[model samples]
Target: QYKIYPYDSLIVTNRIRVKLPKDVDRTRLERHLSPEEFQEVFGMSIEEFDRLALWKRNDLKKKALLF
Candidate 1:
C-alpha cells in the first residue's frame, strides 16, 4: 500500500507537503512518479528540489483562517 508523508516534512515551500511511510521503498516512488505527478504531489520543481531543501520548520505559523 502507498502511504502519504507528513505535511511538515514534505519538500515544498509555497504549497502543501507530504511524506511517505518509513517502510515504503524510495525506489518505488522514484520509478512511479511522473513529472507532472511529481509536481502535483510534491509542489516543487526539479530545480527547486535540487537547489534547496524545503522544510516546514514552524507548525504554529498560520497562513489563513479556517472559518
Candidate 2:
C-alpha cells in the first residue's frame, strides 16, 4: 500500500531542513496567543492554523503543555 520510488532519488536533495525546537524557553501560555502572536512566535502559518482540526490543535497544545 505504498508508492515506490528509487532510493537514489532520496539522496538527490542537499537542502538543510530545519525543525522546530522541542521546547520553548521559560515560556508558558497564559492563554492562547493572539493570532498575530501565534504566527509570529510559532512560525505556523495562519492558513495552516485555520486548516488544523480542533482536536489536532488540542493535541498540539498538549505537547506544548508537556514542555
Candidate 3:
C-alpha cells in the first residue's frame, strides 16, 4: 500500500520586493547649449535631440565620449 499525505494548511508570504530611492531618477542639471554650439558638438539639431529620450541621449553621449 502507498502512503497518503495531506496538508491542512500552507503558509504563503510575499517575497522580497524592490525598493528604489527617488535619487535614482535624479541627475544634475546641465546648461542648455546654443543651437549652433549643439550642432558643432553633437552634429544634430536641437529639435532632433529634444525628440530623443533621456536613455537615448545618454547613449549618444556615451558614443561621443568613445570618439
Per-residue lDDT of model 1, residues 1-67, tens digit only:
5555433343334244444445544333432334444445545564544464323212211221100
> Which residue runs does candidate 2 get wrong by more than 4 Å?
1-32
Better of 1 and 3 by lDDT: 3
Taking the candidates one at a time, how many backbone clashes does each contain? 3, 0, 0
Cα shift from native, residue 67, model 3 (Å): 11
lDDT of 2 by residue, 1-67 (tens): 2222222221113113432233322233313245554444345776666798766655554443312
Q: Estimate each model's TM-score.
A: 0.29, 0.38, 0.41
In the order shown, the candidates' Cα RMSDs to the true structure are 10.2, 15.2, 23.1
**Per-residue alpha-carbon lDDT of candidate 3 for residues 6-63, written as tens digits (9 for 90 to 100):** 1111001111232322332213111222444444456787777679787766665444
Write down the worst ten-residue block by lDDT for model 2.
Answer: 6-15
Worst 10-residue lDDT window, candidate 3? 6-15
Order of the predicted models by lDDT, top scorer first: 2, 3, 1
Report lDDT (Cα) of residue 15, candidate 3: 14
Top candidate (TM-score): 3
